[model samples]
Target: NDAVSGQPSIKGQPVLGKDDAPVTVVEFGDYKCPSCKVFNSDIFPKIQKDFIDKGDVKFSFVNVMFHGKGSRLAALASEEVWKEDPDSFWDFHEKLFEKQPDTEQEWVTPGLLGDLAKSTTKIKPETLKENLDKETFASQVEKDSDLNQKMNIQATPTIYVNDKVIKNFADYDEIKETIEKELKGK
Candidate 1:
């Protein structure tokens, strides 16, 4: 089995970038983690602009359900959006991170997730609400968590760049340099 992507396991996972890109990045994250919020707010945009948009790297997210039910609901809601419209998944994903509440706050409820969906994408509120209430993608999220466990992922914001764990993602230039090196080798 391929260690970074887990092969066919990520067959249906949402991806952002050219499919044939030489470099692949898999991110294990939870919506409710503070550091994850920081990564989303600070680092991800640069990566998106520098690599993902340039067709240099393909990025994927594997939800890590470490926070609580809210995290699970958010993951399900994201998967719901992805199912309805794959193109809008990234926008929905950004919106979810952009509007994140305090970790301890009682946010990310089904109603709020539905509202986020309605406001961010063309997805209907009723469909999102029903899916959230029904936990439509619960098993998908569970499966991702299982993958996380099997991979021995111990924290949020664990990033794998083509099977190499990036320990220092604090600098955008550093990440770009790493991806460029991989691209050159390819």
Candidate 2:
């Protein structure tokens, strides 16, 4: 189903949809990308409801480390939460994106990540803080970036439906049609 010859393996990635769905949506995003925030806020919810929540497709995220330290910290924190509770990962993920600060200046910090984790789950804030401070999930974050390289990703919110890259994923109708086409093909 991969349209690209070198599509990376997503075996251990943090997922956001039905695990066994025939169609897969791989999103290469940066935590600090404003466009990524726009996708998360404006578009992803409907896609989640229509395709992911309905079991029509599976979705996964790959972190792209372009936004520097804060972005890396956010990515590491996300991986830590996924490690802490895969079941609560999606909720935590939504909180991070939804609560994104309007300005990028120091947008993501250990304190912020801890507070977000605290708000979303029963996990202790100090525990999340410790993990973030120590960079316990740094390798996991790096692993995602490595996969991004294999996919030739050059920007945030770069999405792939099945194996083909979606050139205009920002357009709801275009992505919807792409997913529908893949679903029908499957």
Candidate 3:
């Protein structure tokens, strides 16, 4: 078996892109994962520039709650952001990673999380916290984590390029080479 084996699409959710692009990027990550945050801050922008902006790649993000409470809160908050403006979803997502908790204690304190939701997106403070309390979103986050586990996703910031797991993602040329191969006929 190759390292580049599995990925889950969650229905026909092929990376939530413009749908007309040649390549699709699906990112499975836990908000509490420090590595996920690092990739988000450092690598995502390059992907956007190289693909999304050029209209050649469509990207979708799935929130896997490996980090526990903070992760669930982050997932809930992201849904709120998407509800308000689907286009701003990435903006909220990036900021969440940029300002995520460093320690277990900083995870999900209700008041602090509500404040963060307020500062980042236009989501109403009451509505944001209200949604967070609802077990529905929490369950969804759990589902995400569980799905990833079943699929054997051992690490955060795992990227799937049209169903192929990027094994050597640490090397930009390696990742881009695979993507280019995928885009050969286009």
Q: TM-score: which candidate is best?
A: 2
Model 1 segments beyond 4 Å from truth?
Answer: 1-9
Top lDDT model: 2
**lDDT by residue for model 1 over 19-114, one digit each (tens)?**
798888777888887778888889988888888898998999889988888888889998888888888888888888888866477577878787
The residue-by-residue lDDT of candidate 3 on 59-148, one tens digit each, is 877777676666777777776666665665676677778877667565555576567667776667787778778844555566666667
**Backbone clashes in model 3, listed as residue pairs:** none
> Which pairs, if any, clash in model 1?
none
Candidate 2 regions with alpha-carbon error over 4 angstroms? 1-6
TM-score of 3: 0.84
Give the lDDT of residue 32 in candidate 3.
82
Q: Which ranges of candidate 3 are over 4 A from the true structure? A: 1-7, 10-16, 101-105
Better of 1 and 3 by TM-score: 1
Candidate 2 accuracy as TM-score = 0.93
Error of 1 at 49 (Å): 1.5
Model 3: lowest-lDDT 10 consecutive positions: 7-16
Ranking by TM-score: 2, 1, 3
Please write out the lDDT profile of model 2 over residues 130-178, one tens digit for every residue. 8888888888987887787777787788888887788766898888998
Native-to-model Cα distance after best TM-score fit, residue 21 in candidate 1, in Å? 0.7
Q: How many clashes in candidate 1?
A: 0
RMSD (Cα, Å) for all candidates, in order, is: 2.9, 2.6, 2.7
